[PDB]
């Protein structure tokens, strides 16, 4: 686990992203992406320009923790989806377009310690309900079936610092949302609205699924 601390440092000093980008001569879009931990690679030039600009040693810019987590999703999931019809074309409410009877699968997590020794925990996740976050948007909610057998996994998770924990939760969710969304888009055909145009597939991809479980509390 490792993340850049640029977002926190800039907030304490109170400098805005726009001013920093203008001075360090780094394009705003790249600096914003790097402010989030979204980017995968960082150019050596960026590490020095920023470190000289904020009088921060390279140590401060990066937060490290020897722990390391891995997540694998089953190649073959069990999914049943029933078309609901009900004229979704008029009003864009996904529920009208399709309903999930049951979607369950397994995620295998390996918590590698600082020592070479690793621990294996197996999580089984099932569909529960489709919550409506806002009138136009919904979030599929999935709950871990077995949590009592995997209580130990929680002890390793909360040991991380808050910033790393928020990063890990984003990673587990982004993957889950991509996995479930990709499976559904294939089974259900797209429907285009009468009255720019928002096809059903585009709405399904936009939809996000967030795991609801005791292990992850934030």
């Amino acid at each position: 686990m490792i993340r850049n601390r640029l977002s926190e440092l800039l907030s304490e000093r109170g400098l805005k992203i726009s001013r920093v980008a203008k001075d360090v001569k780094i394009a705003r879009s790249s600096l914003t992406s790097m402010a989030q931990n979204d980017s995968e690679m960082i150019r050596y030039d960026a590490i020095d320009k920023l470190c000289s600009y904020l009088h921060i040693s390279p140590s401060e810019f990066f937060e490290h923790n020897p722990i390391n987590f891995d997540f694998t999703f089953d190649e073959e999931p069990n999914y049943k989806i029933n078309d609901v019809f009900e004229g979704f074309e008029v009003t864009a409410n996904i529920t009208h377009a399709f309903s999930i009877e049951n979607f369950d699968f397994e995620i295998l997590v390996d918590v590698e310690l600082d020592n070479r020794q690793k621990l294996n925990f197996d999580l089984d996740v099932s569909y529960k309900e489709t919550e409506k976050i806002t009138n136009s948007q919904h979030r599929f909610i999935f709950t871990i079936k077995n949590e009592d057998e995997n209580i130990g996994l929680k002890k390793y998770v909360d040991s991380l610092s808050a910033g790393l924990k928020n990063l890990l939760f984003k990673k587990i969710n982004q993957k889950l949302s991509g996995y479930v969304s990709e499976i559904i888009v294939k089974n259900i055909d797209d429907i285009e609205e009468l009255f720019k145009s928002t096809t059903l597939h585009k709405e399904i991809l936009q939809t996000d699924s967030r795991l609801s479980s005791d292990i992850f509390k934030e």
């Binding site: 078309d83 019809f85 004229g87 074309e89 055909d189």
Partner: protein, 219 residues
């Protein structure tokens, strides 16, 4: 049994409880739908329309797409059994408009080649519904708009040939009657066995039951 190996079967047993199909073209604002759902034991597969307000009781399902139409027909066996389970009584399956079936099938296939394919879709539907009709004891009823029923002959020919009873519903205080009496001006036909005689072919305040009783028992 060579008889059983082929489809040969006795007529007396086949015509005893047969569920007849009914085609009613009643023009406009007459009560042909009222007629179909008067029994309050009906499942209405209406197409791009909502005329369920007139029915006293029964079951209903909006059809918005050809794909939706295919699904309901294919799963119709499963559906009817559960309404009987819930306790809802379904004895007749009604398609509100034949002209809408022409419009939807046309969209699915979109020339005389196209028209022939449209006729092929219509003939296939009736054959499918019929085999279930004998299995699940459901009367079938289709209704259309006067313009004889308005449509292209290839469809009309198929509908009239297959339909057991074809009737025209007109309003004559005001009395509303279904007249199936033979006539050059309008075409009607009711099928009854030689022994059965219909003394009166015009029914006032008609219902599917009354027609069934007239065609099975003495008028």
């Amino acid at each position: 049994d060579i008889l059983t190996q082929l489809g040969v079967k006795d007529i007396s047993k086949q015509n005893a409880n047969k569920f007849y199909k009914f085609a009613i073209y009643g023009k406009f604002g007459t009560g042909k739908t009222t007629f179909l759902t008067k029994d309050n034991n009906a499942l209405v597969l209406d197409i791009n329309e909502d005329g369920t307000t007139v029915t006293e009781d029964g079951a209903v399902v909006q059809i918005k797409n050809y794909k939706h139409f295919s699904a309901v027909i294919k799963m119709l066996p499963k559906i009817i059994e559960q309404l009987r389970e819930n306790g809802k009584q379904i004895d007749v399956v009604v398609i509100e408009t034949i002209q809408k079936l022409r419009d939807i099938t046309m969209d699915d296939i979109m020339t005389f080649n196209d028209w022939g394919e449209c006729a092929t879709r219509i003939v296939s539907i009736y054959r499918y519904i019929s085999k279930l009709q004998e299995h699940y004891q459901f009367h079938l009823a289709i209704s259309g708009h006067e313009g004889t029923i308005e449509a292209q002959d290839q469809i009309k020919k198929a509908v009239i040939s297959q339909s057991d009873v074809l009737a025209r519903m007109t309003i004559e205080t005001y009395q509303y009657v279904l007249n199936a009496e033979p006539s050059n001006l309008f075409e009607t036909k009711i099928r009854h066995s030689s022994n059965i005689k219909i003394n009166n072919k015009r029914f006032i305040n008609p219902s599917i039951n009354d027609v069934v009783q007239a065609i099975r028992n003495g008028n």
